[PDB]
Amino acid sequence: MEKETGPEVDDSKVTYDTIQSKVLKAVIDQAFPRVKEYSLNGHTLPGQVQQFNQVFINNHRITPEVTYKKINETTAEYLMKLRDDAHLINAEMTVRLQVVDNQLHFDVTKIVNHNQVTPGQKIDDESKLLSSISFLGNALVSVSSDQTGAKFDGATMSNNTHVSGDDHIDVTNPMKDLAKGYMYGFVSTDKLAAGVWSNSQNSYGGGSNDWTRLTAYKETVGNANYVGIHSSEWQWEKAYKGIVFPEYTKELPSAKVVITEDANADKNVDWQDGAIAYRSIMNNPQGWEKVKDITAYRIAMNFGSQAQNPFLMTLDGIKKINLHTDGLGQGVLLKGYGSEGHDSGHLNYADIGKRIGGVEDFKTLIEKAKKYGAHLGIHVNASETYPESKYFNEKILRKNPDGSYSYGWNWLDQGINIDAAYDLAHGRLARWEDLKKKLGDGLDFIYVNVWGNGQSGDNGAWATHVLAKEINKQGWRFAIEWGHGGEYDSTFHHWAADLTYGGYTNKGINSAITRFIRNHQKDAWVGDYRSYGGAANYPLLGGYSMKDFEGWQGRSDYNGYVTNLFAHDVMTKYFQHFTVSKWENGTPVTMTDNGSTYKWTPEMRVELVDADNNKVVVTRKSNDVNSPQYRERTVTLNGRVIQDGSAYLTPWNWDANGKKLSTDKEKMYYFNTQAGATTWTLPSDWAKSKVYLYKLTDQGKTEEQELTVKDGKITLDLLANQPYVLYRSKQTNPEMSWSEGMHIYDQGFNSGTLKHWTISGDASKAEIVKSQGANDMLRIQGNKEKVSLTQKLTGLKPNTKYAVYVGVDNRSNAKASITVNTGEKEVTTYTNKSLALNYVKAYAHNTRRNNATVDDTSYFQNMYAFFTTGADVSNVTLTLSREAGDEATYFDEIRTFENNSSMYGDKHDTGKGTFKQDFENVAQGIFPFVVGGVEGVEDNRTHLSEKHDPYTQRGWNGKKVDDVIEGNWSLKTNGLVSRRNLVYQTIPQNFRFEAGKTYRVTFEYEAGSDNTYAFVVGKGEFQSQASNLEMHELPNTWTDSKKAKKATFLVTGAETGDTWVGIYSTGNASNTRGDSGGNANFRGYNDFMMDNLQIEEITLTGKMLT
Ligand SMILES: CC(=O)N[C@H]1[C@@H](OC[C@H](N)C(=O)O)O[C@H](CO)[C@H](O)[C@@H]1O[C@@H]1O[C@H](CO)[C@H](O)[C@H](O)[C@H]1O
Ligand SMILES: [Ca+2]
Ligand SMILES: [Ca+2]
Ligand SMILES: [Ca+2]
Ligand SMILES: [Mn+2]
């Protein structure tokens, strides 16, 4: 390339003015809100040196008619009239330029559209809206190739660990052309650096073209090249299908420049100085301050009516983590907080799940969690819905150009995507307000799943900012699924924080510039995941690594959850208590992974600081990518080593909510991923103190040991992958009030003792033991006489109907029982040997080997008693018992909760009399059935279907069968045809067919096809050597009937007491009658629904005999 030239500047017809603070002067044009040049401490940066007196309004070029007024020494104002008759533009906007110390503020302070526009109302011609305002072509700041050290540095969105989103461009003549959007952008000389912020929600496209609030341009002026940073275009009045959006969707355009000398004392002026200064002018995502102290994120899952994780139970999980981390902060995402659980009832945000304890228990969870620094969030969806949801309506549904439904997710039911723009234009905001009204204060975050993938149409920067603003207005923090989503407002990105998702192209934001700026404000980054290479091969700042133990994707590994907190998250969060001040890259390395060999330039040293002038230095131990030292760092705090390679001894001076700890509560955490002794220098305020070490377990601080301090040092030679904590004085563990609000003490056997139970019989026969997943359970075995354990049920309401269950896995033939005595009445339920394996994937005691009870299996199933309190609730007792037997019974999870079922002779209490299940008052699950093994351990595709006429019922969109047969609820199975396996079955603890007695079993059913499902009678444990079943294939219920059919069967209990009945998915092909895809799923060809179950003990007489 040859040296470039462009027109010189003739300013003979220009009148300039100046506005200035004490430190910064800006020369501004009186004709147009343009800054020619900035001066600070005798140094200069150009602005827009060549006049460009045009703006673009709705993408039309306009020469504004401008009048000017200098308001005061720092502030000028411009009235800009905008007229273009041919394009129906008739408007005016007012702009102010204001110097605030070393900042320049550009604000559109008033906009008037002379066309008639009413937010929320019809507009007959959308071209009458004032929809976009662009000042592209007027740089807010620039640098010239004639200036020493002229450079531009900008960040774009990249989620590929191999590809940095950052550009670093020397501003030279000649240079390559530049006309490109950026999220962040800095220009600098060797004397001054500038950064630019804008609230513009412009996009130039997806990927690296998105979130492009700035635009950088090269312009050649005389003999110099300038690179200028412009705000990208701003949005204003918008509509969807002629309906103007609500007023709150309009945000007045704003941009700021900040200009700085050296800001990190390294005696160089570059983009890093700009980035430090940029923190004073940037938007900050709402709730960001909380992020640095949320050390323990995880998901607690409910799904398919099962109530795997009742709100009050999650509080016990929080207490376990509080003990095990010694008071680190927590963030629990409640996936399935609403309706029947995860992916039920979407859009009705206020519908808090009733079977997990409803709004009352959710409020209690939020309140009691505060003292543990545990913040709750919920999973919501703003992109698709199901017929059951109150908000399912034809008008909200997304249609394709050909008129067909845009079908969404199919799992429990077939959903349909919604049109998010229609939704915004028709009262979406009110749904968040309804949830806020019902739930009240204290919820931390809303996690909006799926948004950003286009299912509901436009989910880009503007639409996401609007959505985030609705959520933030209720006082909630915004969180999102995708690494690329919600760049402006999000504080958490699930695909950044769960390192296992999506592979190397779909992770967090791969930008040193962006991470420098915002590391402390969000978990949005690239964490350590060696097999992705590039930025993920041991990032020096770490990066959030999320695991779970409460059922999400079948995750149950508590111990691995805790070790991962300490292996990745403690130091990640430590760094978030400081701001990045310096970032030094090393030499490029060559890596090979994921099918390519590529160059990567790694960070080698990162420095951070806080408001107390503490200094943290993180250094990679080697730039050699093939050395073990590439994946090691040292960390110093004011020069003192706190991490070196596999071990750290890190101070922690913040309580679980982030508040500064008192001196006597200051501590240090030790963790080493390897065996071996390590030696550490103590800080001066520890060097002469006594020091005590504790091993951290689910019981809190254990194995107290005073350490020997020699020459101000300590040496630690402890277990690998085991957290420890150090203090300068002896510490104890607090009372945890286990299971508070649940009417019993320590329902999950987490307190390490049984002393709060009254034990009758030989107490040595009852012990707390760990499952194969380390889940503590009550075990009774080897007893020659009855052993019972009793507690009072406390805090009950008088004259109230209740259910109680205990999870039970009985490996003995001996009777294992749950008994409630109300003071006035006693009810009891028992099981002999358990015969049904547990297939509920989100449930902690399913039969997956790694959370098996014993012998690699789990037969845990909920064993219920139903009772009613009288006038006096001071002596209501719950007893677990086990008659004599050699083998073990395991019990875990005692849940007592209001319930209004009437299953026993039309009465509530466990008792004699005809059994009936109308499904209208189910405590949880699909009682008296339990899900079978048809899908193995799964988020089972059988659940309680909820009525919403007409959408859930025959005829809507050609639906062949009703989701709900009678009342508001039925038992629905979605699409589980041709599986040759058991869909669900009774178990004797839920309904016992007594030996030698005969029962009439009746129910109503829908079936979409002939002989796809069968009513079956079995006994003992089902094996798919296959078990004998009595098989009754069921015809479809709609080709020759306008409603569900009634079925009736006689069943005599086998002498072994283990008879059961159920529904089996046959080997027959279903018939979708020429329909396919979403239509076929929605219409119910492959479905089965049951309702109005009745089981009556009878004596065979007369014609019953035939
Ligand atoms: C990872 C995740 O959140 N997936 C949910 C997402 O799935 C679509 C893509 N595969 C993706 O974004 O990852 O959105 C759908 C709803 O449209 C589901 O919520 C996905 O989660 C899945 O939910 C089902 C139950 O519906 C099961 O629990 C799966 O285990 C779970 O991954
Ligand atoms: Ca510097
Ligand atoms: Ca337990
Ligand atoms: Ca019903
Ligand atoms: Mn449903």
PDB file of N, CA and C and ligand atoms in Angstrom, residues 340 344-345 386 388 412-413 943-946 963 972, ligand 5:
ATOM      1  N   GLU A 340     -46.292 -27.650  37.522  1.00  0.00           N
ATOM      2  CA  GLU A 340     -45.963 -29.036  37.862  1.00  0.00           C
ATOM      3  C   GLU A 340     -44.456 -29.296  37.878  1.00  0.00           C
ATOM      4  N   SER A 344     -43.231 -27.159  32.653  1.00  0.00           N
ATOM      5  CA  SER A 344     -44.695 -27.142  32.770  1.00  0.00           C
ATOM      6  C   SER A 344     -45.194 -25.694  32.895  1.00  0.00           C
ATOM      7  N   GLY A 345     -46.358 -25.403  32.326  1.00  0.00           N
ATOM      8  CA  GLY A 345     -47.068 -24.148  32.673  1.00  0.00           C
ATOM      9  C   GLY A 345     -46.356 -22.827  32.330  1.00  0.00           C
ATOM     10  N   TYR A 386     -47.458 -24.134  26.675  1.00  0.00           N
ATOM     11  CA  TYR A 386     -48.213 -25.378  26.525  1.00  0.00           C
ATOM     12  C   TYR A 386     -49.676 -25.055  26.750  1.00  0.00           C
ATOM     13  N   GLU A 388     -51.905 -26.154  28.649  1.00  0.00           N
ATOM     14  CA  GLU A 388     -52.293 -26.068  30.043  1.00  0.00           C
ATOM     15  C   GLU A 388     -52.159 -24.647  30.631  1.00  0.00           C
ATOM     16  N   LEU A 412     -43.209 -33.268  28.307  1.00  0.00           N
ATOM     17  CA  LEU A 412     -44.434 -33.694  29.004  1.00  0.00           C
ATOM     18  C   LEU A 412     -45.674 -33.507  28.130  1.00  0.00           C
ATOM     19  N   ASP A 413     -45.654 -32.436  27.339  1.00  0.00           N
ATOM     20  CA  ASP A 413     -46.725 -32.106  26.396  1.00  0.00           C
ATOM     21  C   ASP A 413     -46.057 -31.493  25.176  1.00  0.00           C
ATOM     22  N   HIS A 943     -47.144 -37.501  33.733  1.00  0.00           N
ATOM     23  CA  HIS A 943     -47.295 -36.444  34.752  1.00  0.00           C
ATOM     24  C   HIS A 943     -48.784 -36.153  34.941  1.00  0.00           C
ATOM     25  N   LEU A 944     -49.124 -35.252  35.857  1.00  0.00           N
ATOM     26  CA  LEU A 944     -50.532 -34.880  36.028  1.00  0.00           C
ATOM     27  C   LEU A 944     -50.872 -33.736  35.077  1.00  0.00           C
ATOM     28  N   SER A 945     -51.772 -34.025  34.150  1.00  0.00           N
ATOM     29  CA  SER A 945     -52.191 -33.034  33.155  1.00  0.00           C
ATOM     30  C   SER A 945     -53.225 -32.088  33.749  1.00  0.00           C
ATOM     31  N   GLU A 946     -53.088 -30.804  33.408  1.00  0.00           N
ATOM     32  CA  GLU A 946     -53.968 -29.764  33.923  1.00  0.00           C
ATOM     33  C   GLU A 946     -54.918 -29.253  32.836  1.00  0.00           C
ATOM     34  N   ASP A 963     -56.691 -33.997  27.314  1.00  0.00           N
ATOM     35  CA  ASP A 963     -55.647 -34.099  28.338  1.00  0.00           C
ATOM     36  C   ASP A 963     -56.301 -34.420  29.669  1.00  0.00           C
ATOM     37  N   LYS A 972     -51.486 -38.251  32.653  1.00  0.00           N
ATOM     38  CA  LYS A 972     -51.168 -38.249  31.217  1.00  0.00           C
ATOM     39  C   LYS A 972     -49.794 -38.842  30.916  1.00  0.00           C
TER      40      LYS A 972
HETATM   41 MN    MN B   5     -48.803 -30.884  31.465  1.00  0.00          MN
END
